[PDB]
Amino acid sequence: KSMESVMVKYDATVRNSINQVVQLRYGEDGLAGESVEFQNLATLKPSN
Amino acid sequence: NNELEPTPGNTLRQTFENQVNRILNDARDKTGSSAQKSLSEYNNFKSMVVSGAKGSKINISQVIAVVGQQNVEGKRIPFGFKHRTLPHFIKDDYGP
Amino acid sequence: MDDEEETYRLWKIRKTIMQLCHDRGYLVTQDELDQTLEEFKAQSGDKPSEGRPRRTDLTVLVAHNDDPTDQMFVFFPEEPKVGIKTIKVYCQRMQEENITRALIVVQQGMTPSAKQSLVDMAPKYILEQFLQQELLINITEHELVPEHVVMTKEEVTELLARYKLRENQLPRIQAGDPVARYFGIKRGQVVKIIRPSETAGRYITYRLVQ
Amino acid sequence: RKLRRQMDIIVSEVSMIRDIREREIRIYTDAGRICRPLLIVEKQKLLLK
Amino acid sequence: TKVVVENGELIMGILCKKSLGTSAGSLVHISYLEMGHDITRLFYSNIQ
Amino acid sequence: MEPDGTYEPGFVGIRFCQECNNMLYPKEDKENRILLYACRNCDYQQEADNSCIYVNKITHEVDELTQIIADVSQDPTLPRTEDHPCQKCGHKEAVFFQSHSARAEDAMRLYYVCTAPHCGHRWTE
Amino acid sequence: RAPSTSDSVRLKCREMLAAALRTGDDYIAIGADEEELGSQIEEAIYQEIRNTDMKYKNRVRSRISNLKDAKNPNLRKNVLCGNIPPDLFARMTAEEMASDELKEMRKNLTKEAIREHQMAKTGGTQTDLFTCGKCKKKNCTYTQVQTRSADEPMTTFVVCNECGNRWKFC
Amino acid sequence: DREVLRVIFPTGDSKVVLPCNLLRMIWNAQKIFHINPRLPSDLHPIKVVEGVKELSKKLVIVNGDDPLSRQAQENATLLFNIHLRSTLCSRRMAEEFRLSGEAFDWLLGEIESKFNQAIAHPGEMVGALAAQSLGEPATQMTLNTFHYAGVSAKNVTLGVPRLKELINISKKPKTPSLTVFLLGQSARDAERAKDILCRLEHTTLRKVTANTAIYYDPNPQSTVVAEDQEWVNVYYEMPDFDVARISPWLLRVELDRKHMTDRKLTMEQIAEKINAGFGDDLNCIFNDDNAEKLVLRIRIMNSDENKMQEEEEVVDKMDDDVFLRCIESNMLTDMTLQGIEQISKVYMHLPQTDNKKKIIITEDGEFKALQEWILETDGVSLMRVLSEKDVDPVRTTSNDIVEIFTVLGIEAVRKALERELYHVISFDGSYVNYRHLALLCDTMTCRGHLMAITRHGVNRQDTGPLMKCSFEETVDVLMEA
Amino acid sequence: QEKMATNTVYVFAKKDSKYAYTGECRSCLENSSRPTSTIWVSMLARGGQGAKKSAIGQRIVATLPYIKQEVPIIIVFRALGFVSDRDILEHIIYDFEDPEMMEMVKPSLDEAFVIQEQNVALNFIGSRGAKPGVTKEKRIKYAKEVLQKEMLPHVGVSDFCETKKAYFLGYMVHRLLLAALGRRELDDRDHYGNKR
Ligand SMILES: [Zn+2]
């Protein structure tokens, strides 16, 4: 009943039923979560 | 004997109840680990557990060796029968 | 109590507010930023005797905003509960000084008329009010705190222009926020909120003051 | 109890309980009480033949 | 013991569920990405 | 005055009024410089036997060794011990237990009551 | 070096302090006069307080308690022989004086027991079975969860305390 | 980027969910192109550099006509661009990946294609998706037993009741809590931490007293309490001129030396506390800690003059006997000798070897764990706890989101709720997408106001009339509308 | 249907409210009607006041049938006519030799002196019952009927069984007092022997 008020918009910004902006873009990237995957960055490697 | 040493930041009873619990857990785990060894790879059960189906070693413990301690909210069964659980037990009994 | 440690509080709050002023853009001297408590006692010649006027000594002018409007003022009232009487004398002092901004730091409570008079003050002048215990710890030192930047009206103009953003659409920010009180932000103004992103690496948002 | 054991006292109804801790003997003959039959052990042995 | 497949050819490795699906690093997720739902559904029906 | 003495003054919980069996109340005789005890409902009043009229914060003593008649010993479900000599009677069958109450007794230490006739003694080891 | 003062109360405290040093003849055997020592202690309290404060009087009183002790006469004696100068003795730096014989022992063991009260919180677990590839040490913890759950198989989850690593039996 | 990355992840975990597994994609090129370690690795490194620079341009999510949008473009893509830049290094391509330029060139087209794919559909009702994304893990074992030991108290009651309460935004948690960090030596010195423990911990006067008793004492110095008799008698420097009229009645309290061991306390602190609270009107005297027992015997300051039935006022201003009880009733129950007056009296200990935290950078640039003493407390006086010396105001947090709003504000709230929801989620161990949790916090905070997003706050909302009426009240919103 | 056993006084904590402890017993008639006759003795946790008496938390305040508010147990004892504290104490315990039991009851004794007369006590209880005008015969007479019939019917509503009635209440308080002192263990609600 709470979360039904919100949807994604075509300008990538996340907005509500009264068109106000929730986010600059959905998940701060606008990309699909399904296309996300677990990865090691490994740049936090111990020795410089 | 009251010669038992209470755990720091805990009561002697809390230590005692904790201490008996480690033992009942270590033994069951040890006897469980014996059963994990004791089973052939030929077994359907080990086959079922390994495959990632609906089974595990704890099951083997429960089916073959030992179910383990029953508890109430994680605590040993309370003395609902006047400082006892049942009239089959002696008063002040603390057996598992 | 109130014998030595108090100096540490007065030192730390003095640094917190100076860093605050420094953060406001005012060119606080690095040494003022850098000074120690031992030096702080030394700088004020603190504690030749007890029950003196450190709060009168703590009272200071702040000076900077690369934009030379100059002259912000900070006053520490001696009374825990401040009355209009001290506010009028203060009003006289700020008027006589013709300062641009006055910050008054109160220890405890205030009369509602003084509270009112502080709120209204003057349509063309601002008076600032800070409670000493809330100053006693710098909240912006906290790890959960994002970076807040006040936006120029033109930046706001450019922001709306670039997106075609409606004023309503912008998330509001309540002026009841201590941090809002920290920036001295005014209603209708926008603050730039800089956050780390676990997704983007960097996330920037904005809220208009309500 | 011997009257209880003699069936001159209704075992099916008459309950008789003593608490040394309270220095009390309570007895109840009201309806709705649950009871069950048990073997009577005497001298760590069964009374039955 | 350890699982390894090359050019659609299984070199070694007894299979598990973490391989078989509903988890990260699963064959199912990457087939969905490369082969797409349509090829993956026919493979899945076929294997079963 | 030494850290080896004790404080058992034998506090006087109450004394009834001879006129009504009601409690007598403290009072000073500022004229005679002496403590007195009086009933409220009547004119009955009498001098005090001690300067102490009050005590506070309780229970730092061995209650469980008290308030326990040896008649517990008749309970068969209470275990006898093979440990002999009723601290009195040269006979075993001492009955034993913890405190078993509210302070329920982090003291899991056994407390011994001989069940042998002619002693009734409650101790512990 | 007898320090004379003009204040009657100070002298009166000095007389009271001289009286406290009279305890148990030790001043005789050492041969030091109680009045001079009593006068030097009060002056020293005064050298710091510079006023007949109740708290100043309190220091005399804490000094009184230390003087009037009978379980540590060697304390008085250490003071009397100049090993603990009156200006030092007054200058506290002894944490409720009780050195020699037992309260110090008690004080140490008390410092031990209150130190012990952090030592283990109230719990435990560690298993030390699974190696952690982030630190080679088998400093790991294990989980028994997913009694039934859904289609996901019941797993044993292992977490490494140090360097935070968690992985599954599967 | 490596230097920046240390800031972004203080946990030092480099394993994150991200789009497009380039390793698998790069590997597939090798499987396709048939590159092997016994074949030469012909490559033009500048092409690699340019390919990354061009692909970076391809990473468009917003216009690039102005630098701010580009800055918006740059920061939003920043983390991915670092994964991309770290992966697509010239040395990696030639040495580790041994890719050919053609293999690299085909791969670039593939990566971009993967990028084009990652884009979510505009118009999406992701919000309904997120509500379901919260609802499903709530169904699991969020309430299944307090399995947590962690050398401490069970705190901050697991799951749904906290989740229900959280949704209900109860003014105060059912189980408030606060984690006390220790700066410098306190993290390594127990003795320092205990000194903090003594300073922080709540202490009532009733907590401190061994016993109390009321006595009739003819003479303050020739007391009837003969054990204390030299102790009173020896005192004389006390103004005993106004004590010739003070309460003839004696009140005496016995103090727990065990408590003095317990909280590390002293008599002088106690006497000065009592007088400051009650004022000058209460006379206070005590024996030394080296005595047989700690006792404190008190008197009322009957200041000689008008305090002697001066104006009758047939009221009996106060009887003595009863007044010793009113003070004692008040003495035990009211006075707090030490501590915050709502934190009960807790500070459970944990060795920071507990979790992946306080991981610190070193000269080598490698991450290392820092062990420490910590207390987990039940309490929420965030101003007071922040105000405490030696405790770290930076890391110190509390389970109460309300104090975060009150002190740090709604922005800090957005993060703490985010951490806490994640924390409940971390307990169930079932991964849930983070973006949604980030999204959820935005929804509650979008107003900048802390309020129940439930029906308990709908009337304050600016939402449409059909929405509010849909919340079962119907007619009331509709009549007003 | 599972119910709790009647005519059996049980003590439970009421710490969720201003009441430190509670002792309850229902006193329904054996056959006549089984009206229930629920009795509450609740220990009030008003551990404090101000400058009034520094110790309100030792009050007990009985909960009488039909009465518009709660009243001290000791007031009932005055209505029973036992004006002598010694007599009430025997009613409380045959062994007052324990000072601890004596000190705990002492604050209830302080309450007893505001009303000594049985007649005033009956009118008092009646005044708490309702307002039949100034006719304080009726409040007493009503109190008399409640004391006989509405109070502990299970022992008998006969006049001479009022003194006899008094003997049960003191043990009931005593049982409460042991548990309130802590000497008694807290009664279980889950126990079936305490159930019917
Ligand atoms: Zn009398």
Ligand SMILES: [Zn+2]
């Ligand atoms: Zn014997």
Ligand SMILES: [Zn+2]
């Ligand atoms: Zn590890």
